[PDB]
Amino acid sequence: AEEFPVPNGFESAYREVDGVKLHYVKGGQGPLVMLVHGFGQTWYEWHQLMPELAKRFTVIAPDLPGLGQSEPPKTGYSGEQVAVYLHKLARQFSPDRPFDLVAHDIGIWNTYPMVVKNQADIARLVYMEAPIPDARIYRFPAFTAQGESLVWYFSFFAADDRLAETLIAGKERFFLEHFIKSHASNTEVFSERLLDLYARSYAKPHSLNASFEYYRALNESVRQNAELAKTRLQMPTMTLAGGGHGGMGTFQLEQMKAYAEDVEGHVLPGCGHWLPEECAAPMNRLVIDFLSRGRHH
Amino acid sequence: AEEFPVPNGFESAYREVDGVKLHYVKGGQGPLVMLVHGFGQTWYEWHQLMPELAKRFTVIAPDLPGLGQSEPPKTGYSGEQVAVYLHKLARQFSPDRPFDLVAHDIGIWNTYPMVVKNQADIARLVYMEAPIPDARIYRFPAFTAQGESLVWYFSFFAADDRLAETLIAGKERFFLEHFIKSHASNTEVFSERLLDLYARSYAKPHSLNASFEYYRALNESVRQNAELAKTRLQMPTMTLAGGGHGGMGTFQLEQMKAYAEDVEGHVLPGCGHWLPEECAAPMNRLVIDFLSRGRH
C-alpha cells in the first residue's frame, strides 16, 4: 500500500538500514539528491519538486524513521542517531560520489550531524525552515504580542507523561490542520483532501509517538551539536525561510552563517513554514537552480 | 450543591454584579479581605487560609467569572473587564472602608486594573505567583535545556480553533494533574480527591472555555496595562513566589518594584507555583502578619 500517490515514473520502495526498514520514493537519473521532510509530513511534501529535479538528478525522498512508511529507529531519535540511517541510505545509492541534500524542518536536525561528520560526501546543501539544534532555540519566546509563538510546541511535544500523544490521539486530523495552518501564510494550499492524507499517516500510533520522540531528543541533539559545530561546513549551502506568517524569516540565514563558510540565503515573502506547498514556484526554482550549479545529468 | 466543602463558620452565597451571578464563600468579622484564585482552581485554594484570617477580618473568596460556580462575564475576559466585577463585589461588602486584596496566578491579571484605578479602595495588597500582564511576559522562553518551560501553556491556551478545549475535553483530569504537578515542588499535597474536585469543576464546558478565554484576552490585557501602569501603586504591597521547581522566584518582586512604591517580597524555598497548598503554613503566616499590620 501507498499512503501518498507516487509521481509518474517514480518508484516507492524500502531499504533496510541497520535493522530499520526505511521507505523512500525514487526517480530520475544522474547524481543523487536526497530530500528530507519534516514534522507533520512525509516524503510527499516534495512531490511537486521531484519530477523537475529528476530531469537532472537521481532523486530520493525517504520517510524519517517512525514517520510515513518507515520503521522507528532502533538506536534513538537524537540527530546524530537518526543521521546515521539517512547517511547510510544515501550512500547505498551513491557509494562512490558525493550527493546533494535538501532538508526541511526536523529534516535539518536529522541530517546536520552526518553532513558535518562526512563533509566529503555532501556536494551541495539546502536547508529550510527550522533551527539547527543549538543554544539559540532556548531564546525563542513562549508567547508573543500577536499570540502563539513559533516553537512553544517544542515544550508541548517534549513534555513528560506522554502529554502530547494522550491529548492528540484520536484528534490527529483536527490537530494537524491547526498546526499546519497556524504556521502558514498561504493557508489555502492546505485543502481538506491534502490534510486528510497527512493526518492519516501521522495517526498511526507508532508515527504519532515517533513524531514527539524527535522533540524529546532535542536537548540531546543540542548537546551533540555543541561538539560537532567546532568544525564549520565547507560545501556550498543555501538557506530558505518564509517571510510570512509562521516562517523563520531572517533567523535561518543568520544562524547558518555560524555553521557554514559558503552560504547564500533567501526569505520568501508571503510564505510561511511550508515552503514546498505554499510557494512551490519560487521555492522549486531556487532549489533547482542552486543544485544545477554543480554537475548534473 | 457545592463543588467544594465550605469551612465551618463560612457561607457559600451569590451576588449579582452587572448582570453576572458571582459565587463566593464568606466568613469572619472586621475589615474586608478579598482572596482571588487563579487558573485550574477556585475559591477552594484559600480554604486553609480563610479560617485563620477570619479571626481578624471579614474574608470573601469569589470564584472568577466562568469558573467554579460563577457565571461567565457578560462583557469579556480582559483584565479591565473582569476587574470591574471583582471591584463591585468587594464594594458591596466594604462600601465605607478600603479593603485588602490577596491574589494568586490569573487572580492578579483580573485585579490589577481595579487596584490601580481605585487606589483609595485598597488598603493593602498581596500578589503571588504570576506576572502582571506586561511586555515582560514576551521574554519567557518556549523551551529549556531541562525540558518544558514554565509558560509555553500561554500559547496553548491562547490558540484559536478552541485548540485547548478540543484537545483537553474528555481528558480534563489527566491534563490538570499534569499541569498542576509540572508547576509544583510539593506534588504530594495534590491528593487524588483534591485533583478530582478541581478537575470536575473546570471540566464544566463553560468553565473549560472560560479558563482559556482569560489567556485569549492576555495580549489585550497587556495593552490595557501599558496605559494603566503610568500610575504607580501607592499602598503597602507584599509579593510571594515559590523558590522551587514550578515557581516564579525573584521575578515576582522584581516586576512589582516597577509598579509599587512600597513593596516587600519573599521567595519561599522548596515551594512551587501553588503556594496556598504546597506551602500553606509559611504562606498563611506571611499573609496574616502582613495584613495584621493594618487595623483589624
XYZ file of C-alpha atoms in Angstrom:
593
model
C 0.000 0.000 0.000
C 0.957 3.635 -0.519
C -0.061 6.405 1.848
C 0.557 9.057 -0.843
C 0.427 8.953 -4.640
C 3.759 8.414 -6.329
C 4.605 10.807 -9.155
C 4.611 9.235 -12.600
C 7.889 7.471 -13.316
C 8.933 7.185 -9.680
C 9.062 4.058 -7.539
C 8.076 3.543 -3.908
C 10.427 1.096 -2.203
C 12.161 0.131 1.036
C 15.723 -0.355 2.203
C 16.780 -1.997 5.454
C 19.453 0.139 7.132
C 20.968 -1.027 10.418
C 17.900 -3.191 11.080
C 15.370 -0.473 10.286
C 13.161 -0.636 7.206
C 13.163 2.811 5.575
C 10.579 3.813 2.984
C 11.579 6.092 0.123
C 10.392 7.297 -3.258
C 12.995 7.374 -6.040
C 13.154 8.547 -9.633
C 15.394 10.121 -12.241
C 18.972 9.696 -13.400
C 22.247 11.442 -12.644
C 23.981 12.493 -9.416
C 21.982 11.779 -6.260
C 19.873 14.318 -4.394
C 18.231 13.280 -1.129
C 15.185 15.289 0.041
C 14.341 15.012 3.767
C 10.922 16.071 5.088
C 9.904 17.481 8.462
C 7.311 17.294 11.198
C 3.674 16.806 10.264
C 4.580 15.494 6.829
C 6.323 12.752 4.849
C 8.240 12.382 1.590
C 5.112 13.704 -0.131
C 5.849 17.342 0.647
C 8.472 17.044 -2.123
C 6.189 15.511 -4.758
C 5.932 18.679 -6.881
C 9.671 19.367 -6.813
C 10.667 15.748 -7.502
C 9.716 15.465 -11.223
C 11.613 18.655 -12.072
C 14.754 17.579 -10.214
C 14.546 14.093 -11.739
C 15.265 15.544 -15.177
C 18.818 16.225 -13.955
C 19.358 14.089 -10.848
C 18.585 10.755 -9.298
C 16.139 11.863 -6.598
C 15.394 10.013 -3.359
C 12.880 11.167 -0.746
C 12.841 8.967 2.375
C 10.323 8.916 5.209
C 12.039 9.759 8.516
C 12.259 6.838 10.939
C 8.878 6.184 12.524
C 7.104 8.593 10.148
C 5.372 7.888 6.856
C 6.050 4.252 5.961
C 9.439 3.975 7.734
C 10.027 1.880 10.829
C 11.061 3.633 14.060
C 14.788 3.937 14.735
C 16.321 1.181 16.850
C 19.036 3.372 18.350
C 17.201 6.582 19.187
C 15.759 9.841 17.916
C 18.626 12.277 18.531
C 20.002 13.970 15.438
C 23.260 12.060 15.480
C 21.464 8.709 15.785
C 18.923 9.353 13.039
C 21.543 10.887 10.737
C 23.317 7.517 10.601
C 20.308 5.907 8.960
C 19.926 8.682 6.397
C 23.634 8.843 5.537
C 23.828 5.084 5.009
C 20.645 5.129 2.921
C 22.041 7.832 0.637
C 25.416 6.099 0.329
C 23.757 2.862 -0.793
C 22.624 4.747 -3.912
C 25.745 6.907 -4.212
C 28.660 4.855 -2.794
C 31.427 6.400 -4.945
C 30.338 10.037 -5.353
C 29.117 12.859 -3.089
C 25.386 13.594 -3.118
C 23.226 16.680 -2.651
C 20.953 17.228 0.333
C 17.759 19.246 0.775
C 16.083 19.208 4.185
C 13.069 20.909 5.768
C 12.219 21.396 9.457
C 13.319 18.423 11.586
C 14.899 17.040 8.424
C 17.652 19.505 9.325
C 18.012 18.107 12.851
C 18.242 14.604 11.409
C 20.893 15.382 8.793
C 23.220 18.028 10.202
C 25.376 15.532 12.124
C 26.019 13.348 9.087
C 26.845 16.407 6.973
C 29.444 17.722 9.398
C 30.888 14.233 10.055
C 31.059 13.290 6.365
C 31.661 16.573 4.564
C 33.287 14.930 1.544
C 30.043 13.001 0.929
C 27.934 16.169 0.584
C 28.343 18.157 -2.643
C 25.762 20.887 -2.045
C 23.303 21.543 0.764
C 19.928 23.274 1.043
C 18.347 23.812 4.453
C 14.931 25.367 5.026
C 12.612 26.376 7.804
C 13.962 25.255 11.164
C 16.786 25.975 13.573
C 19.768 23.668 13.706
C 19.580 22.409 17.303
C 21.760 24.667 19.433
C 21.523 27.170 22.303
C 19.617 29.605 20.066
C 16.472 27.507 20.495
C 16.319 28.434 24.190
C 15.899 32.086 23.180
C 12.630 31.667 21.259
C 9.655 33.101 23.216
C 6.830 31.102 24.790
C 4.269 33.753 23.870
C 4.158 36.771 21.562
C 2.323 40.075 21.266
C 0.451 38.518 18.297
C -0.496 35.236 20.008
C 1.012 31.751 19.936
C 4.749 31.702 19.234
C 6.583 29.693 16.613
C 8.016 26.978 18.836
C 6.011 26.759 22.047
C 5.089 23.334 20.716
C 8.655 22.145 21.404
C 7.673 22.097 25.101
C 4.271 20.502 24.431
C 5.845 17.690 22.391
C 8.765 17.191 24.796
C 6.545 17.100 27.909
C 6.570 14.012 30.136
C 3.649 11.658 30.825
C 3.046 11.307 27.078
C 1.147 14.587 27.354
C 1.014 15.285 23.608
C 0.061 11.767 22.445
C -2.529 11.451 25.168
C -4.245 14.691 24.177
C -3.809 14.338 20.401
C -4.602 10.635 19.874
C -7.947 10.399 18.079
C -7.831 14.116 17.223
C -4.870 13.980 14.851
C -6.752 15.422 11.902
C -8.001 18.394 13.936
C -4.599 18.968 15.485
C -2.647 18.786 12.250
C -4.910 21.263 10.444
C -4.418 23.725 13.281
C -0.676 23.141 13.481
C -0.140 23.475 9.743
C -2.390 26.482 9.138
C -1.087 28.344 12.199
C 2.403 28.087 10.674
C 1.271 29.148 7.190
C 0.879 32.403 5.250
C -0.779 30.844 2.193
C -3.141 28.590 4.142
C -5.328 27.931 1.102
C -2.988 25.275 -0.301
C -3.952 23.023 2.610
C -7.127 21.572 1.233
C -9.211 19.242 3.338
C -8.138 16.432 0.957
C -4.427 17.138 1.475
C -4.812 17.434 5.248
C -6.677 14.106 5.258
C -3.654 12.443 3.580
C -1.123 13.794 6.029
C -3.309 13.170 9.064
C -3.983 9.527 8.175
C -0.246 8.893 8.081
C 0.737 10.502 11.332
C -2.298 8.994 13.122
C -0.663 5.558 13.004
C 0.074 5.149 16.725
C 3.795 4.482 16.211
C 4.036 7.555 13.945
C 2.255 9.834 16.393
C 4.651 8.720 19.109
C 7.705 8.850 16.838
C 6.855 12.448 15.924
C 7.146 13.555 19.539
C 10.262 11.493 20.281
C 12.224 13.808 17.955
C 11.370 16.660 20.342
C 12.068 14.540 23.420
C 15.587 14.087 21.974
C 16.045 17.788 21.113
C 18.123 18.685 24.167
C 20.356 15.696 23.453
C 20.721 16.906 19.852
C 21.731 20.346 21.131
C 24.425 18.728 23.294
C 25.669 16.657 20.349
C 25.825 19.683 18.075
C 27.778 21.789 20.572
C 30.708 19.482 19.861
C 30.060 18.960 16.158
C 29.846 22.672 15.389
C 33.521 23.120 16.256
C 34.031 22.361 12.562
C 32.282 24.621 10.024
C 30.628 23.286 6.872
C 32.786 23.834 3.783
C 30.448 22.919 0.904
C 28.130 25.302 -0.953
C 24.999 25.868 1.114
C 21.694 27.674 0.584
C 19.060 28.517 3.199
C 15.393 29.254 2.549
C 12.857 30.657 5.007
C 9.359 32.048 4.792
C 8.917 35.773 5.386
C 5.183 35.495 6.022
C 3.172 34.264 8.980
C 4.698 31.146 10.524
C 8.074 31.454 8.821
C 11.567 31.663 10.312
C 12.441 34.848 8.449
C 15.968 36.172 8.837
C 16.858 33.676 11.581
C 17.570 30.886 9.113
C 20.443 32.570 7.285
C 21.753 34.318 10.379
C 22.187 31.034 12.249
C 23.586 29.262 9.190
C 26.363 31.852 8.900
C 27.743 30.474 12.180
C 27.817 26.977 10.672
C 28.848 27.434 7.040
C 31.695 29.158 5.196
C 29.785 29.416 1.911
C 26.104 30.263 2.373
C 23.508 32.246 0.490
C 20.076 32.785 1.938
C 16.611 33.760 0.788
C 13.477 34.840 2.633
C 10.353 34.243 0.535
C 7.693 36.915 1.024
C 4.110 35.822 1.598
C 5.208 32.296 2.523
C 5.210 30.656 5.954
C 6.745 27.413 7.157
C 5.510 25.081 4.427
C 7.591 26.332 1.527
C 7.168 23.467 -0.964
C 3.358 23.757 -0.803
C 2.762 27.447 -0.016
C 5.277 28.759 -2.502
C 6.040 25.913 -4.907
C 7.054 28.005 -7.916
C 9.698 30.226 -6.332
C 10.941 27.573 -3.933
C 11.321 24.904 -6.611
C 13.136 27.391 -8.834
C 15.589 28.399 -6.109
C 16.367 24.765 -5.310
C 16.708 23.545 -8.909
C 18.936 26.488 -9.849
C 21.166 26.105 -6.796
C 21.687 22.370 -7.294
C 22.218 22.819 -11.023
C 25.356 24.878 -10.426
C 27.060 21.546 -9.742
C 27.398 18.718 -12.260
C 24.070 17.160 -13.218
C 22.574 14.909 -15.881
C -24.964 21.768 45.583
C -21.374 22.722 46.374
C -18.347 21.881 44.279
C -16.043 22.129 47.311
C -16.614 21.751 51.059
C -17.292 25.014 52.905
C -15.343 25.629 56.154
C -17.255 25.838 59.426
C -18.362 29.402 60.120
C -18.401 30.263 56.427
C -21.277 30.610 53.972
C -21.472 29.854 50.261
C -23.514 32.568 48.552
C -24.107 34.544 45.388
C -24.386 38.165 44.355
C -25.446 39.638 41.044
C -22.895 42.132 39.767
C -23.663 43.867 36.476
C -25.976 41.016 35.486
C -23.471 38.275 36.309
C -24.168 35.874 39.189
C -20.918 35.538 41.155
C -20.293 32.780 43.681
C -18.234 33.395 46.794
C -17.514 31.959 50.212
C -17.566 34.431 53.092
C -16.936 34.395 56.830
C -15.438 36.340 59.701
C -15.862 39.863 61.011
C -13.815 43.047 60.729
C -12.336 44.888 57.732
C -12.708 43.059 54.416
C -10.048 40.924 52.738
C -10.826 39.518 49.287
C -8.899 36.428 48.163
C -8.799 35.796 44.407
C -7.835 32.419 42.949
C -6.216 31.555 39.619
C -6.161 29.044 36.802
C -7.058 25.419 37.422
C -8.611 26.308 40.755
C -11.458 28.037 42.547
C -12.129 29.804 45.867
C -11.206 26.480 47.480
C -7.458 27.027 47.155
C -7.888 29.526 50.015
C -9.786 27.193 52.344
C -6.872 26.702 54.749
C -6.069 30.420 54.964
C -9.693 31.509 55.376
C -10.449 30.301 58.926
C -7.224 31.868 60.236
C -7.813 35.203 58.521
C -11.427 35.205 59.679
C -10.283 35.625 63.284
C -9.341 39.226 62.452
C -11.102 40.073 59.163
C -14.246 39.550 57.136
C -12.996 37.213 54.385
C -14.523 36.790 50.940
C -13.253 34.361 48.313
C -15.060 34.652 44.974
C -14.992 32.297 42.037
C -13.670 34.127 38.971
C -16.291 34.715 36.250
C -16.941 31.485 34.358
C -15.005 29.380 36.869
C -16.161 27.479 39.934
C -19.821 28.375 40.447
C -19.672 31.894 38.959
C -21.422 32.797 35.712
C -19.214 33.841 32.763
C -18.602 37.576 32.301
C -21.118 39.350 30.064
C -18.529 41.898 28.947
C -15.302 39.944 28.369
C -12.277 38.221 29.879
C -9.708 41.033 29.675
C -8.237 42.196 32.967
C -10.032 45.535 32.915
C -13.384 43.899 32.209
C -13.103 41.195 34.831
C -11.734 43.587 37.458
C -14.978 45.591 37.346
C -16.918 42.572 38.625
C -14.471 41.883 41.436
C -14.238 45.546 42.451
C -18.011 45.945 42.592
C -18.399 42.686 44.521
C -15.891 43.840 47.141
C -17.558 47.251 47.398
C -20.917 45.619 48.130
C -19.348 44.321 51.337
C -16.948 47.179 52.077
C -18.667 50.376 50.858
C -17.217 52.664 53.547
C -13.669 51.397 54.103
C -10.791 50.307 51.904
C -10.356 46.533 51.703
C -7.358 44.214 51.431
C -6.650 42.160 48.340
C -4.781 38.881 48.005
C -4.459 37.350 44.532
C -2.765 34.276 43.037
C -1.937 33.474 39.396
C -4.539 34.930 36.975
C -6.251 36.469 40.011
C -3.505 39.076 39.578
C -4.499 39.722 35.943
C -8.111 40.110 36.974
C -7.489 42.541 39.823
C -4.576 44.791 38.858
C -6.703 47.240 36.840
C -9.185 47.825 39.634
C -6.340 48.240 42.143
C -4.565 50.912 40.085
C -7.807 52.705 39.155
C -9.263 52.663 42.686
C -6.227 53.007 44.948
C -8.212 54.655 47.745
C -10.291 51.466 47.945
C -7.291 49.178 48.523
C -5.703 49.176 51.957
C -3.016 46.504 51.489
C -2.114 44.284 48.533
C -0.649 40.768 48.332
C 0.247 39.325 44.929
C 1.688 35.838 44.426
C 2.873 33.619 41.615
C 2.081 35.300 38.309
C 3.293 38.192 36.195
C 1.189 41.322 35.985
C 0.402 41.329 32.237
C 3.070 43.457 30.543
C 5.821 43.082 27.941
C 7.924 41.054 30.369
C 5.770 38.041 29.523
C 7.163 38.020 25.975
C 10.637 37.242 27.355
C 9.777 33.858 28.880
C 11.313 31.033 26.831
C 9.370 28.492 24.771
C 11.700 25.638 25.674
C 14.506 24.994 28.157
C 17.610 22.808 28.381
C 15.737 20.778 31.030
C 12.515 20.222 29.084
C 9.186 22.050 29.091
C 9.241 25.709 30.080
C 7.027 27.440 32.639
C 4.690 29.322 30.333
C 4.511 27.600 26.943
C 0.945 26.984 28.120
C 0.175 30.648 27.462
C 0.362 29.917 23.706
C -1.526 26.612 24.007
C -4.381 28.253 25.908
C -4.467 31.398 23.745
C -4.511 29.446 20.481
C -7.584 29.713 18.305
C -9.760 26.908 16.875
C -10.576 26.077 20.511
C -7.298 24.155 20.427
C -7.164 23.662 24.189
C -10.823 22.739 24.769
C -10.787 20.354 21.843
C -7.653 18.508 22.930
C -8.444 18.541 26.666
C -12.140 17.640 26.646
C -12.530 14.049 27.843
C -9.068 14.243 29.412
C -9.605 17.100 31.874
C -8.413 15.205 34.941
C -5.314 13.914 33.161
C -4.425 17.347 31.867
C -4.992 19.197 35.133
C -2.884 16.696 37.046
C -0.011 17.170 34.598
C -0.362 20.954 34.645
C -0.513 21.202 38.426
C 2.282 18.740 39.144
C 4.588 20.169 36.456
C 4.284 23.538 38.204
C 4.743 22.102 41.710
C 7.614 21.306 44.009
C 5.427 19.553 46.548
C 3.226 17.270 44.471
C 2.135 15.125 47.424
C -0.324 17.793 48.621
C -2.387 17.145 45.493
C -4.282 14.030 46.507
C -6.495 12.083 44.112
C -9.508 13.543 45.922
C -8.312 17.154 45.610
C -7.448 16.705 41.941
C -10.848 15.076 41.352
C -12.590 18.121 42.847
C -10.645 20.654 40.808
C -10.964 18.626 37.614
C -14.734 18.223 37.946
C -15.149 21.970 38.382
C -13.074 23.153 35.422
C -14.433 20.371 33.189
C -17.857 22.033 33.092
C -17.915 23.044 29.438
C -18.430 26.759 30.150
C -15.642 26.677 32.752
C -13.200 24.845 30.486
C -13.775 27.538 27.882
C -13.671 30.348 30.452
C -10.293 29.062 31.668
C -8.727 29.607 28.277
C -10.566 32.830 27.459
C -8.501 34.511 30.167
C -5.423 33.638 28.080
C -7.080 34.586 24.789
C -7.513 38.059 26.318
C -3.940 38.257 27.665
C -2.484 40.386 24.866
C -5.442 42.753 25.260
C -4.757 42.889 28.996
C -1.091 43.702 28.296
C -2.191 46.547 26.045
C -4.638 47.797 28.684
C -1.998 47.690 31.404
C 0.516 49.648 29.311
C -1.714 52.677 29.851
C -2.739 51.908 33.429
C 0.857 51.473 34.632
C 1.512 55.183 34.095
C 0.140 55.442 37.633
C 2.273 53.680 40.254
C 0.686 51.771 43.135
C 0.939 53.594 46.464
C -0.473 51.132 49.009
C 1.617 48.727 51.110
C 2.257 45.653 48.966
C 3.787 42.225 49.551
C 4.799 39.725 46.896
C 5.243 35.971 47.370
C 6.794 33.468 44.994
C 7.973 29.895 45.090
C 11.729 29.309 45.003
C 11.385 25.674 43.986
C 10.502 23.874 40.782
C 7.458 25.485 39.167
C 7.827 28.813 40.958
C 8.491 32.370 39.728
C 11.420 33.022 42.062
C 12.817 36.549 42.034
C 10.671 37.661 39.097
C 7.640 38.431 41.243
C 9.282 41.073 43.433
C 11.467 42.468 40.670
C 8.473 43.133 38.440
C 6.466 44.558 41.329
C 9.234 47.067 42.083
C 8.421 48.695 38.731
C 4.763 49.014 39.779
C 4.714 49.769 43.502
C 6.419 52.379 45.665
C 6.042 50.395 48.893
C 6.765 46.708 48.344
C 8.365 43.856 50.246
C 8.819 40.384 48.826
C 9.564 36.827 49.825
C 10.701 33.796 47.883
C 9.776 30.516 49.577
C 12.431 27.829 49.158
C 11.103 24.334 48.486
C 7.781 25.598 47.105
C 6.494 25.814 43.553
C 3.598 27.671 41.969
C 0.735 26.532 44.194
C 1.709 28.351 47.371
C -1.547 28.045 49.337
C -1.463 24.253 49.016
C 2.239 23.430 48.625
C 3.380 25.682 51.443
C 0.261 26.573 53.383
C 1.765 27.221 56.783
C 4.501 29.701 55.863
C 2.397 31.355 53.162
C -0.505 31.770 55.594
C 1.807 33.196 58.249
C 3.322 35.744 55.886
C -0.077 36.896 54.608
C -1.643 37.084 58.071
C 1.252 39.041 59.546
C 1.430 41.439 56.595
C -2.290 42.214 56.730
C -2.343 42.459 60.528
C -0.012 45.465 60.386
C -3.158 47.349 59.404
C -6.099 47.942 61.730
C -8.216 44.798 62.093
